[PDB]
Amino acid sequence: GPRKNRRERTTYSRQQLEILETLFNETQYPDVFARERVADQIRLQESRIQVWFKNRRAKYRLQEKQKP
């Protein structure tokens, strides 16, 4: 689900998944301009959102076999 550790924007929101679905999709340029950007989307720190950037970005390995 939308969480890498335990914390999140709320009980369950797409924002947590936006950091990636938006960034990871926008481009493969993992730089301050990226994290600092999505940070305004989910309303989180620029350097903090980085930790969540792996939320979905990492799930890519799980869904690789999960989905049909």
UniProtKB/Swiss-Prot annotation:
Compartments in which it is found: Nucleus; Chromosome, Telomere
Tissue specificity field: Broadly expressed during early embryonic development. During later embryonic stages, expression is detected in AWB olfactory sensory neurons but is absent from there by early L1 larval stages. Expression in non-neuronal cells including the excretory cell and intestine is maintained through adult stages.
DNA-binding residues (ranges): 5-64
Family: Belongs to the paired homeobox family.
Protein function: Binds to the telomeric DNA sequence 5'-TTAGGC-3', requiring at least 1.5 repeats for binding. Bends telomeric DNA and may provide chromosome stability. Also required for development of AWB olfactory neurons.
Comment block on domains: The N-terminal and homeobox regions are together sufficient to bind telomeric DNA. The C-terminal region is required for bending of telomeric DNA.
Name of the protein: Homeobox protein ceh-37
Organism: Caenorhabditis elegans
